[PDB]
Design a protein around this ligand. Structure first.
Ligand code: K16
Ligand code: MG
Ligand code: MG
Length: 127
RNA sequence: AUCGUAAUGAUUAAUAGGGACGGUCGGGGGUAUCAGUAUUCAGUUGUCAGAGGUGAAAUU
């Protein structure tokens, strides 16, 4: 029936990666970031840039033959934030609204089982 | 020295303490040992123009 890729959406708070691979992830099909859609750094992670990135990703997927994708959303994780960035929701809605078919959705944010020391110092970053 | 007298001679066990013992109970300690993902670094792979960071930037 359908041909599945894997839409690996990495939504940090400074950028948004929309990366579609095969099932294994060893073959990259399309990787469009929110920074390729705007010329200002402050909105590289904007929902608008993520939507444009997703539309370009869907267009590239269609001409290669990918008709459906599984979703692996992730935040920065590690010692940094575990909540996904603002662009991951827009890239997901744009992908679903672009004619690509959606399979399983999962959050794959890296979470330590403890961890290393987090930047900022003992008193945190004072603002 | 022996013998005879005598009701012959030792206070409780403290909701003080100490000790023993019996099933436990603890992220109490020491010495080994076994996980976990994460971080970074490295090796292979895949694409292609940005990535990072910020209030905005810039160093990179
Ligand atoms: C860390 C040293 C200063 C440097 N200056 C330059 C001018 C400027 C202009 C802004 O607006 C154009 C702006 O955005 C807020 C931030 C700044 C920064 C703020 C900072 C003061 C800090 N101490 C208290 C106030 C405050 C508030 C914040 O939100 C905030 O976040 C980074 C930080 C702070
Ligand atoms: Mg303050
Ligand atoms: Mg007693």
């Amino acid at each position: 029936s359908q041909v599945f890729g894997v839409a690996r959406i990495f939504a940090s708070f400074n950028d948004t990666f929309v990366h579609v691979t095969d099932l294994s992830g060893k073959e990259t099909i399309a990787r469009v970031t929110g920074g390729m859609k705007v010329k200002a750094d402050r909105d590289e992670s904007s929902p608008y840039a993520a939507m444009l990135a997703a539309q370009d990703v869907a267009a590239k997927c269609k001409e290669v033959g990918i008709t459906a994708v599984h979703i692996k959303l992730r935040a920065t994780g590690g010692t940094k934030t575990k909540t996904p960035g603002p662009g991951g929701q827009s890239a997901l809605r744009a992908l679903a609204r672009s004619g690509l078919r959606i399979g399983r959705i999962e959050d794959v944010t890296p979470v330590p089982s403890x961890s290393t020391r987090r930047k900022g110092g003992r008193r945190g970053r004072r603002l």
